[PDB]
Subunit: 488 residues, 3 copies
């Protein structure tokens, strides 16, 4: 043997995975990873977020103090979960802007209630109904005070309560809507009631409407629920000639991370940052396809059910078994110890060795990409709706749909673009190792065109190792090689 | 002739088109295609979407049953088109939340009306006005029932209508606003009217306001229009001591693809998926600059009036007419049969041949890109407004403007980035064919530096063809070539 | 000296700056520039936008004509600035949809007021209060007319005012809310008041609510403020049996660039296109981290406090002082005159020269990128809120947060992607100059593997200059070089 072959090549695998680039619709790589979380455990983890299971109670029924919700008094949450099974079992009521009251109480994160010393002169307090049983007898909302006539008169109620504290007070109050003119006069002497609740800049002016509503728990009557916020330095005044459902005091308002979610998923003893109505999901992936409704440190919702990011190079796996070949022809499935390396034929037979510098350079770039590819949101907007509403709901749905489409586009582009760069940097390290070998060899070898060098001199395993190391002296073999090349 | 020249080159065209990349503000390519649809036919195609021309009717006037809109009874649509010419010709009315009622009826896609057997005891039904002529005599809205006194009394009306069906019922009802106290007492005996319309969870409480409004079709009086949805299992109760404009029954509510658009474009017998107020547009392009208002499978609206995607490579078109040159100097306008190929000078004169593998590889990548570059939206938000409104309209306009700017950015970046990759992959196939030729030739040729090889041996057309094929044996010419190179 | 060394290399700097690419977390470049404006001067520049300092006045108090705001009569602005110090000093009032009235007046950009000849028959005009002093005596809002009884009667007021102009008229009017039934009867004879204000399609129906509000400037009474727009051809009718706070005329409505901002930043005599509440900012950078609230030609708000765009190439700065080396080993800190160039050792010693073509090509591409990297928004949505409101505020905040996150993502990706292309194009120009030199030299030099050529012939400074120029004849040295290469 007067010559040697030194082939440059890269690893390949028997299986392999198809991914998208900018340049190729489908290209096989050695390895890929999923960027879309498509699976939930089905359970909401009660750590690290404080989960409050509403059970049979909406947040509003906990707020008002519906007797079967009295267990939620002074409750606090990071996430209130309202169940499908929830029912109201007190006086039948409406909240004109239900969604807003639900939202601002949810965001406050507390039903911390402070009873205040309201003095109601010339009226009988603590009115009850058989539609709102507490214990054996008739009762009412724990946080509201049903005022009616004393003897045969109902005076103009005119009370004030100053806010001398350094936080916002939330006052929940109501207006009674009697079923008949008979019912109006019996409870509140005047034929037409009135509830004015004001601060220095704000006022609410509500007139009760007499009439039969649908029978609920015995009653065709209704309470309409209102709220007033009073800031530090400001004051509350309540003025009524009838139909006032009075506050007992205020809810202490807070700022921070608290929200509310509709889910029937059971609460479990586990740890997960990200909550969806389907259950907790892991947040290791940048994107998720489980639910557009999320709470906590979550992947971004996208329309795609899968996105495959390349974590490896292009995968390139008839009687001629002796010959060796390089990267121009194909990859090497035998190459265990590295991504790139050498195969040679010489005096001492066939050998193979990985190159760790080229291998590590490729791995370090891909790991750096993965590091950057792998935000916490708390109270957001509602994304599902049980009633048709028109304009506001149309805008809420259009905002979320706009968002999903823009992030879905961002996710599609990012994966295609990074996959393009991963193919390119992995091809680049192969070419760099071939060029680096070419430059060492000088005039002692020529390019066989298959990603291998024909070395035109005796090059034993020690000689080959010197090429694989930095240290090969072209000069010591130059005479021998030039003679082999340019004569025979 | 002891030598040959083999030049590697690519095609060019006399004309050419400027495009944007990341790296170059303007770069000439052989071919480009438009990604922004900037043109409409001016006509809405009535296929495949069911178009309902409102003609002289708004959707609300079709809903209420304004006599000149009676042709729209039980009508269904995918897209209702409201015309500028539309007029109301019945009782003068307002709809407090007009936009929401218009939106939820539009989205429902039907005026399927089911008359119900409401019994109105102690009142005269079917009230009419000269402001709402049907035939020769006075009339009213087809879907509403104007109730007034019978003899000299108007009782407390207290009727119920249960929803035992498995769909949502939409009830349209109204409150009459008389011009004078005289007019109030004459129609409805009580000096002050009342309309309470409720379900188990919802109630609406409306008090009529007596006063002169502007004279419209004889009248300073007005009807205010309200709606109530009642779900399966729930019930409607209507309670009034006066001024009730009664429903005759319900509209059957549906979910799906239906919407409404303001346009004066004529309806034509043609096929187009995408509808704009300017007329139908083709949807072959990813983007459009015609209108931010669209219906159906449409290109995304962007601010740009043109975006040019490269579908070809860089376009590179003094006494020395004999000599040939390669891709380093320029492209070849003569190259008819391919994108890349060969030019040679030898014993048998000057020849030229295209390389189909390199040509097809470039074409297949570009066609794959185009395949991915070439969403259906139905009911959205309003994007134009005839009245100033403040907060809600500001948010609707800000949402749409936010969207347009983000998609305009996405379109600008995508075209620049894909154009960068198209230039790079087209340059790459040229370099790959030059390197592939270099490797075949081994020590029989050297690089002339103009993208041509000087072959240092007699290489006839058969020899050249063997280089253009896979099959060239450097060994059979090596002796001859080394002698030609390293002596003379 | 029978040989020469010609090294190809690029410049480097002692310092250098770390930037992000797609491929590298951190990579050192010779130069970089900031894309995020993080600094304000602290002052709003009064050029080129017309700034109106509200001083002690909100826009609404300027509109209504609160005496201490009478200096703002007929005022116009591009940007109204409301100060924290602003106070109201007239009749205590609420505006049911304050934010909308504030928004549509701000967007109109004018308080141009036209007094109209309203005739109020059977009522005493120009009612005043000690809570609204103008001069020594009691007064009222300049733009409103407080109507009360004349003698002992208050008739049904029924006035009309047609719009025969070709612009929209904005009418500001109000309803008085007395503290007691005593106060209602004394001012307006009827026990229950009424204000109906209508156009042909629109009507507002307001009933006053009697009751004590919190004491403000002597009074527990309140005025509620309403607005009506009347288009050309349409007409206004006002109908009241009491409590009407009458308009004196209309505000002329305009379309265009006008908005409003909350700021305590002082107004200065300087020029800046972009205004934030923190003060004016320069708009040379694409992005800014100062405030999501902006007015004018502004950078886009992003979460990042810094983004570094590469404006230069990769920065690559033991007894062996004689030897020279090329770009494979490192960059040259000595290279003053260019980005790329040549170093050589020959008969006449060591030399160095820059290549201007390669240098200029790299600079022109980078300057073109910077040109494209370096939008005006006027009236937008509110982005900060002094009160909790629920649903609408949740949507306004969610829209802005959605926007910030999408632009922050766009800015992160764009910088990483352009930096990737800047590294690649700067590496490319180096490789192109090395390949261009290689092709000139033909068989007279071989690649030393350090980005230098060993020229195997005597190559003096004139010979080297001919290589640096286009004009080097390999043939004249070929014999000498082949002899030097393939013998000794
Ligand atoms: C305005 O118009 C509305 C609607 O028409 C009226 O509201 C209805 O009012 C009646 C009561 O006046 C409700 O009818 C039923 O009342 C029963 C009371 O029980 C006693 O009376 C019945 C007489 O038939 C006896 O059979 C019974 O033994 C008792 O002696 C309830 O028992 C009924 O309950 C309902 O729910 C249960 C659930 O288990 C069912 O089993 C029953 O079948 C039934 O569905 C029922 O409530 C009726 O519900 C009201 N309807 C609505 C829609 O609200 C107003 O009264 C009227 N107002 C005025 C002033 O006239
Ligand atoms: C509260 O205040 C409002 C506004 O001031 C009043 O509303 C106006 O009411 C009057 C009717 O009382 C309207 O005036 C006109 O009525 C005409 C009726 O026709 C007969 O009477 C006139 C007497 O001048 C004769 O000329 C005519 O031959 C008939 O005998 C209409 O014909 C008028 O029509 C209008 O439109 C036509 C379109 O073709 C034009 O040709 C006319 O020029 C005219 O513009 C007109 O309607 C008046 O329109 C009402 N104005 C508004 C703005 O609504 C309320 O009456 C008042 N209420 C109370 C209780 O006092
Ligand atoms: C419904 O309920 C509300 C709230 O309870 C009542 O509103 C309060 O009304 C009273 C007046 O009736 C307000 O009290 C004070 O009135 C003073 C008037 O000055 C004279 O009277 C006092 C008698 O104590 C003398 O001391 C004084 O010398 C005068 O002769 C004001 O001077 C008070 O001013 C306030 O602000 C100044 C700021 O400098 C402070 O210095 C004072 O300490 C004080 O804070 C004060 O206004 C009281 O403010 C009202 N409260 C609210 C919350 O509105 C309604 O009167 C009641 N309605 C009915 C019909 O009963
Ligand atoms: C195919 O590609 C995937 C994704 O790059 C490779 O999986 C990743 O492998 C690395 C190294 O084994 C894992 O890193 C380790 O993670 C654990 C847990 O955080 C940590 O304790 C260790 O210190 C280390 O950082 C990484 O988690 C893992 N990623 C995933 C998503 O599974 C995989 O190795 C590749 N497969 C083959 C056969 O090469
Ligand atoms: C310049 O580039 C454009 C865009 O790539 C080329 O136009 C495209 O040409 C192809 C092949 O001729 C067309 O494909 C055909 O489309 C029809 C209709 O769908 C189909 O029936 C055929 O089977 C085939 O797929 C393609 O539609 C057409 N695109 C456009 C937008 O016109 C064009 O060929 C290039 N010009 C030159 C001179 O090379
Ligand atoms: C490092 O990179 C920065 C950014 O590319 C270079 O700063 C830029 O330098 C150019 C040329 O000196 C400046 O252009 C000039 O701008 C002025 C003002 O508009 C104009 O009158 C001139 O005709 C010219 O166009 C450019 O403004 C400047 N940009 C910034 C942001 O400072 C800088 O030269 C580089 N540093 C080194 C040491 O190479
Ligand atoms: C809910 O929390 C509030 C405090 O936020 C409790 O109010 C205190 O009640 C005790 C009763 O002995 C009083 O001594 C305190 O003065 C009250 N605090 C304040 C700030 O007024 C309230 O008792 C709690 N209720 C429940 C059911 O836990
Ligand atoms: C998470 O829950 C949502 C809502 O329950 C699921 O969305 C529904 O999925 C069903 C079953 O595939 C479809 O029939 C409906 O069209 C979906 N409705 C809506 C409103 O989205 C979602 O598929 C669940 N995801 C996972 C992974 O469990
Ligand atoms: C509109 O459609 C409804 C059905 O959705 C029609 O209602 C039916 O009318 C016929 C009249 O003979 C009755 O026999 C049916 O009982 C009605 N159906 C229901 C479900 O109640 C209605 O007639 C249609 N009207 C028009 C003008 O086409
Ligand atoms: C589609 O229709 C819209 C609305 O009519 C056009 O937009 C207007 O275009 C005119 C004429 O160029 C301008 O004067 C207006 O400023 C535009 N108004 C609005 C509200 O956009 C649009 O140009 C039409 N496009 C096509 C291609 O016909
Ligand atoms: C505010 O501007 C309006 C014009 O927009 C002024 O109204 C004019 O007042 C003069 C007074 O002599 C009359 O002659 C004109 O007829 C009025 N114009 C119109 C269109 O009616 C108004 O005077 C200005 N007020 C202030 C304080 O500057
Ligand atoms: C511009 O002004 C805003 C609002 O005053 C500043 O934002 C606040 O910054 C302070 C101090 O860093 C923080 O404590 C607050 O959390 C921020 N509040 C809000 C609502 O953003 C902003 O930092 C200012 N920027 C500059 C450059 O002056
Ligand atoms: C082979 O790759 C495919 C890619 O879709 C994957 O689903 C499968 O699990 C892999 N199988 C093995 C045995 O590695
Ligand atoms: C030449 O190219 C330009 C590009 O703007 C195009 O507008 C024109 O139609 C072309 N002309 C011919 C004859 O191909
Ligand atoms: C050196 O570069 C750093 C980059 O962070 C910069 O902050 C510093 O001002 C520079 N110093 C000099 C002397 O150029």
């Amino acid at each position: 043997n007067s010559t040697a072959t030194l082939c440059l090549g890269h690893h390949a695998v028997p299986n392999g995975t198809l991914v998208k680039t900018i340049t190729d619709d489908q290209i096989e790589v050695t390895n890929a990873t999923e960027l879309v979380q498509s699976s939930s455990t089905g359970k909401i983890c009660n750590n690290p977020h404080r989960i409050l299971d509403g059970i049979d109670c909406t947040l509003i029924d906990a707020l008002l103090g519906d007797p079967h919700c009295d267990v939620f008094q002074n409750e606090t949450w990071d996430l209130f979960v309202e169940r499908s099974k929830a029912f109201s079992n007190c006086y039948p009521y409406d909240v004109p802007d239900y969604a807003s009251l639900r939202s601002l109480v949810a965001s406050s994160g507390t039903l911390e209630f402070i009873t205040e010393g309201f003095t109601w002169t010339g009226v009988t307090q603590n009115g009850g109904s058989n539609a709102c049983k507490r214990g054996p007898g008739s009762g009412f909302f724990s946080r509201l005070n049903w005022l009616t006539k004393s003897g045969s008169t109902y005076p103009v109620l005119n009370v004030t309560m100053p806010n001398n504290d350094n936080f916002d007070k939330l006052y929940i109050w109501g207006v009674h809507h009697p079923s008949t003119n008979q019912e109006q006069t019996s409870l509140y002497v005047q034929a037409s009631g009135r509830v004015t609740v004001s601060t220095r800049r704000s006022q609410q002016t509500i007139i009760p409407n007499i009439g039969s509503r649908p029978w609920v728990r015995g009653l065709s009557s209704r309470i309409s629920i209102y709220w007033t916020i009073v800031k530090p330095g400001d004051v509350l005044v309540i003025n009524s000639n009838g139909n006032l459902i009075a506050p007992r005091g205020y809810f202490k308002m807070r700022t921070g991370k608290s929200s509310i979610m509709r889910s029937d998923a059971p609460i479990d003893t586990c740890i997960s940052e990200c909550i969806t109505p389907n259950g907790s999901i892991p947040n290791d992936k940048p994107f998720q396809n489980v639910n557009k409704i999320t709470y906590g440190a979550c992947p971004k919702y996208v329309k795609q059910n899968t996105l495959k990011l390349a974590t490896g190079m292009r995968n390139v796996p008839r009687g001629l078994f002796g010959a060796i070949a390089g990267f121009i022809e194909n990859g090497w499935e035998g190459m265990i110890d590295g991504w790139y390396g050498f195969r040679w034929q010489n005096s001492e037979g066939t050998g193979q060795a990985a190159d760790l510098k080229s291998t590590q350079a490729a791995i370090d770039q891909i790991n750096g990409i993965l590091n950057r590819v792998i935000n916490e949101k708390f109270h957001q907007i509602e994304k599902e709706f049980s009633e048709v509403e028109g304009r506001i709901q149309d805008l809420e749905k259009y905002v979320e749909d706009t968002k999903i489409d823009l992030w879905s586009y961002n996710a599609e582009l990012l994966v295609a673009l990074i996959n393009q760069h991963t193919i390119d940097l992995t091809d680049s390290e192969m070419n760099k190792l071939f060029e680096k070998t070419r430059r060492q060899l000088r005039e002692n070898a020529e390019d066989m065109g298959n990603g291998c060098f024909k070395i035109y001199h005796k090059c034993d395993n020690a000689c080959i190792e010197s090429i694989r190391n930095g240290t090969y002296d072209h000069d010591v073999y130059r005479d021998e090689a030039l003679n082999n090349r340019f004569q025979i």
